[PDB]
Subunit: 80 residues, 2 copies
Protein backbone atom coordinates (compact mmCIF):
# COMPACT_ATOMS: atom_id res chain seq x y z
CA UNK A 1 0.00 0.00 0.00
CA UNK A 2 2.82 2.43 0.85
CA UNK A 3 4.65 3.61 -2.28
CA UNK A 4 7.96 5.46 -2.52
CA UNK A 5 5.95 8.40 -3.88
CA UNK A 6 3.98 8.57 -0.61
CA UNK A 7 7.21 8.35 1.37
CA UNK A 8 8.65 11.21 -0.73
CA UNK A 9 5.73 13.50 0.15
CA UNK A 10 6.08 12.61 3.83
CA UNK A 11 9.84 13.22 3.68
CA UNK A 12 9.21 16.70 2.29
CA UNK A 13 6.83 17.41 5.18
CA UNK A 14 9.59 16.35 7.58
CA UNK A 15 12.18 18.53 5.80
CA UNK A 16 9.77 21.44 6.20
CA UNK A 17 9.13 20.79 9.88
CA UNK A 18 12.89 20.48 10.55
CA UNK A 19 13.59 23.56 8.44
CA UNK A 20 11.06 25.59 10.43
CA UNK A 21 12.90 24.56 13.61
CA UNK A 22 16.20 25.61 12.00
CA UNK A 23 14.63 28.96 11.10
CA UNK A 24 13.52 29.70 14.65
CA UNK A 25 16.87 28.69 16.13
CA UNK A 26 18.56 31.06 13.67
CA UNK A 27 16.15 33.83 14.60
CA UNK A 28 16.73 33.31 18.32
CA UNK A 29 20.50 33.09 17.92
CA UNK A 30 20.41 36.33 15.92
CA UNK A 31 18.52 38.01 18.75
CA UNK A 32 21.07 36.72 21.25
CA UNK A 33 23.97 37.78 19.05
CA UNK A 34 22.58 41.30 18.70
CA UNK A 35 23.09 41.70 22.45
CA UNK A 36 26.76 40.56 22.46
CA UNK A 37 28.29 44.03 22.84
CA UNK A 38 25.45 45.33 24.99
CA UNK A 39 25.04 42.98 27.94
CA UNK A 40 25.22 45.55 30.73
CA UNK A 41 23.00 47.94 32.64
CA UNK A 42 19.33 48.17 31.76
CA UNK A 43 19.75 45.83 28.78
CA UNK A 44 20.74 42.95 31.08
CA UNK A 45 17.68 43.44 33.27
CA UNK A 46 15.39 43.90 30.28
CA UNK A 47 16.29 40.63 28.58
CA UNK A 48 17.17 38.42 31.57
CA UNK A 49 13.87 36.55 31.37
CA UNK A 50 14.28 35.78 27.68
CA UNK A 51 17.79 34.47 28.36
CA UNK A 52 16.46 32.12 31.06
CA UNK A 53 13.75 30.94 28.66
CA UNK A 54 16.25 30.48 25.83
CA UNK A 55 18.66 28.39 27.90
CA UNK A 56 15.89 26.12 29.17
CA UNK A 57 14.39 25.60 25.70
CA UNK A 58 17.59 25.10 23.72
CA UNK A 59 19.30 22.84 26.25
CA UNK A 60 16.23 20.60 26.43
CA UNK A 61 15.65 20.44 22.68
CA UNK A 62 19.21 19.53 21.66
CA UNK A 63 18.89 15.88 22.81
CA UNK A 64 15.46 15.55 21.20
CA UNK A 65 16.92 16.55 17.83
CA UNK A 66 19.88 14.24 18.40
CA UNK A 67 17.51 11.33 19.03
CA UNK A 68 15.65 12.16 15.82
CA UNK A 69 18.79 12.36 13.70
CA UNK A 70 20.17 9.12 15.18
CA UNK A 71 16.91 7.31 14.43
CA UNK A 72 16.83 8.52 10.82
CA UNK A 73 20.53 7.73 10.37
CA UNK A 74 19.96 4.12 11.40
CA UNK A 75 16.92 3.82 9.15
CA UNK A 76 18.82 5.30 6.19
CA UNK A 77 21.86 3.09 6.92
CA UNK A 78 19.75 -0.07 6.78
CA UNK A 79 17.50 1.10 3.96
CA UNK A 80 17.70 -1.60 1.31
Amino acid sequence: KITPEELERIAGNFKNAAGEAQSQINRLEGDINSLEGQWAGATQAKFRGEFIQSKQAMQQFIPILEGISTDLKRIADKFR
Copy 2:
Protein backbone atom coordinates in the same frame (compact mmCIF):
# COMPACT_ATOMS: atom_id res chain seq x y z
CA UNK B 1 24.14 34.85 35.40
CA UNK B 2 23.36 33.65 31.87
CA UNK B 3 25.40 35.62 29.32
CA UNK B 4 25.07 36.03 25.55
CA UNK B 5 28.30 34.02 25.20
CA UNK B 6 26.93 30.97 27.05
CA UNK B 7 23.74 31.15 25.03
CA UNK B 8 25.73 31.41 21.78
CA UNK B 9 27.54 28.16 22.51
CA UNK B 10 24.27 26.40 23.33
CA UNK B 11 22.64 27.87 20.22
CA UNK B 12 25.44 26.58 17.99
CA UNK B 13 25.03 23.10 19.44
CA UNK B 14 21.31 23.37 18.74
CA UNK B 15 21.87 24.56 15.16
CA UNK B 16 24.12 21.54 14.71
CA UNK B 17 21.58 19.11 16.17
CA UNK B 18 18.90 20.46 13.83
CA UNK B 19 21.26 20.50 10.84
CA UNK B 20 22.15 16.85 11.46
CA UNK B 21 18.45 15.93 11.43
CA UNK B 22 18.08 17.78 8.12
CA UNK B 23 21.10 15.88 6.78
CA UNK B 24 19.64 12.49 7.72
CA UNK B 25 16.20 13.18 6.23
CA UNK B 26 17.98 14.21 3.03
CA UNK B 27 19.86 10.90 3.03
CA UNK B 28 16.67 8.93 3.60
CA UNK B 29 14.71 10.92 1.01
CA UNK B 30 17.47 10.32 -1.55
CA UNK B 31 17.15 6.58 -0.89
CA UNK B 32 13.37 6.78 -1.31
CA UNK B 33 13.60 8.78 -4.54
CA UNK B 34 16.11 6.31 -5.98
CA UNK B 35 13.56 3.49 -5.61
CA UNK B 36 10.90 5.09 -7.78
CA UNK B 37 12.20 4.03 -11.19
CA UNK B 38 12.46 0.36 -10.26
CA UNK B 39 9.31 0.20 -8.11
CA UNK B 40 6.92 -1.42 -10.60
CA UNK B 41 9.31 -4.33 -11.14
CA UNK B 42 10.39 -4.79 -7.53
CA UNK B 43 9.31 -7.55 -5.17
CA UNK B 44 7.45 -4.90 -3.25
CA UNK B 45 6.72 -7.16 -0.27
CA UNK B 46 10.42 -7.09 0.64
CA UNK B 47 10.17 -3.32 1.18
CA UNK B 48 7.02 -3.29 3.29
CA UNK B 49 8.66 -3.42 6.72
CA UNK B 50 11.17 -0.67 6.02
CA UNK B 51 8.48 1.46 4.37
CA UNK B 52 6.20 1.15 7.41
CA UNK B 53 9.07 1.92 9.79
CA UNK B 54 10.27 4.94 7.81
CA UNK B 55 6.74 6.31 7.34
CA UNK B 56 6.22 6.04 11.11
CA UNK B 57 9.54 7.71 11.95
CA UNK B 58 8.99 10.65 9.61
CA UNK B 59 5.33 11.21 10.47
CA UNK B 60 5.66 10.86 14.21
CA UNK B 61 8.37 13.49 14.50
CA UNK B 62 6.55 16.19 12.54
CA UNK B 63 4.32 17.35 15.45
CA UNK B 64 7.29 17.15 17.81
CA UNK B 65 9.36 19.40 15.54
CA UNK B 66 6.35 21.72 15.19
CA UNK B 67 6.09 21.92 18.99
CA UNK B 68 9.78 22.81 19.18
CA UNK B 69 9.55 25.42 16.43
CA UNK B 70 6.45 27.01 17.98
CA UNK B 71 8.12 27.04 21.42
CA UNK B 72 11.15 28.84 19.97
CA UNK B 73 9.00 31.25 17.98
CA UNK B 74 7.24 32.30 21.18
CA UNK B 75 10.56 33.18 22.82
CA UNK B 76 11.77 35.07 19.75
CA UNK B 77 8.42 36.92 19.62
CA UNK B 78 8.76 37.92 23.29
CA UNK B 79 12.24 39.16 22.43
CA UNK B 80 10.75 41.39 19.73
CA UNK B 81 7.93 42.62 21.99
CA UNK B 82 10.29 43.35 24.89
CA UNK B 83 12.72 45.16 22.61
CA UNK B 84 9.91 47.26 21.09
CA UNK B 85 8.39 48.30 24.43
